[PDB]
Amino acid sequence: MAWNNIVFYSLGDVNSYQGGNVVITQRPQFITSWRPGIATVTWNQCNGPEFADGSWAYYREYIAWVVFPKKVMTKNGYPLFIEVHNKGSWSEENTGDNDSYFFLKGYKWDQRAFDTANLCQKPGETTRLTEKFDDIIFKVALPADLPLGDYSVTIPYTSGIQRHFASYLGARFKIPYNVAKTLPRENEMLFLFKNIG
């Protein structure tokens, strides 16, 4: 009988980027990087064995995610619009969403394994994620009506790896975008720039 275990491992990283001096018709950029690290299970869905002892085959489908806001409000109520500049090999999906960009990288599929493993780790459990993916470069559209000077903007967002283990070849599952939208946003980009007329 068939089973599928899917576990989302969330990375919490804090980074800053200097977007340098800009006038208000320029779109300063920032680069978000994927830093291998310790991730925490923030979601799962499982109906199969929780532990592979080594004696039997299972199949892996791994997909990295980034969920990133499309707009960032300042404390006074002004919006900063977040635009894609270069997303490398990330797949930009569910583009009609009001609020959030969804970037996916499905890098492993149909891959048979016998490796002993924990196939349904529970939320709050941690593991080390060694994988590395492309940077994403964002540009920011500043408002004409927005005011001047030095700015420091904290931007929370979600990144992590979906690991899907299945009993069969050809197994496919993608975390629904509505689920990905509401996952904990454990990363932070502190974006700095100096504004001018």
Ligand X SMILES: CC(=O)N[C@H]1[C@H](O[C@H]2[C@@H](O)[C@@H](CO)O[C@H](O[C@@H]3[C@H](O)[C@@H](O)[C@H](O[C@H]4[C@H](O)[C@@H](O)[C@H](O)O[C@@H]4CO)O[C@@H]3CO)[C@@H]2O)O[C@H](CO)[C@H](O)[C@@H]1O[C@@H]1O[C@H](CO)[C@H](O)[C@H](O)[C@H]1O
- Identify whether the C-beta of residue 126 lies closer than 8 Å to the C-beta of residue 40: yes
- Between 76 and 178, CB nearer to ligand X: 178
106: Cα within 13 Å, side-chain hemisphere: 14
Q: Which of 93, 97, 134, 188 binds ligand X (CB under 6 A)?
A: 93
174 lies in the site for ligand X, by CB under 6 A: yes
Q: How far is the CB of 93 from ligand X (least distance, A)?
A: 5
Region class of 155: left (phi > 0), else alpha (psi between -120 and 50), else beta: beta
Question: Is residue 105 near ligand X by the rule CB under 6 A?
Answer: yes
Q: Is residue 104 part of the contact set for ligand X (CB under 6 A)? A: yes
Question: Which window, 25-33, 37-45, 101-109, 155-163, contacts ligand X (CB under 6 A)?
Answer: 101-109
CB 113 within 8 A of CB 60: yes
Which 49-88 positions form the footprint of ligand X (CB under 6 A)?
61, 63
Residue with Cβ nearer ligand X (27 or 60): 60
Residues in region 129-148 near ligand X by CB under 6 A? none
- Residues of this chain, 1-60, that bind ligand X according to CB under 6 A: none
How open is the CA angle 21-23-26, to the nearest 5 degrees?
95
Tell me how far apart the alpha carbons of residues 101 and 158 are, in angstroms, rounded to a whole number: 10
Query: Which residue, judged by CB position, is nearest to ligand X in the bound state?
Result: 106
- Please identify, among the stretches 2-10, 24-32, 98-106, 153-161, the one whose residues bind ligand X according to the rule CB under 6 A: 98-106
Q: How many CB atoms lie within 10 A of CB 165?
A: 24
Min separation Cβ 37 and ligand X, Å: 21
Residue 111 as a binder of ligand X (CB under 6 A): the answer is no
d(CA 72, CA 154): 9
For strand 136-141 and strand 149-166, is the pairing parallel, antiparallel, or unpaired? unpaired
- Pairwise CA distance, residues 120 & 2, whole Å: 15
Give me the residues that bind ligand X (CB under 6 A), please. 61, 63, 91, 93, 104-106, 109, 172, 174
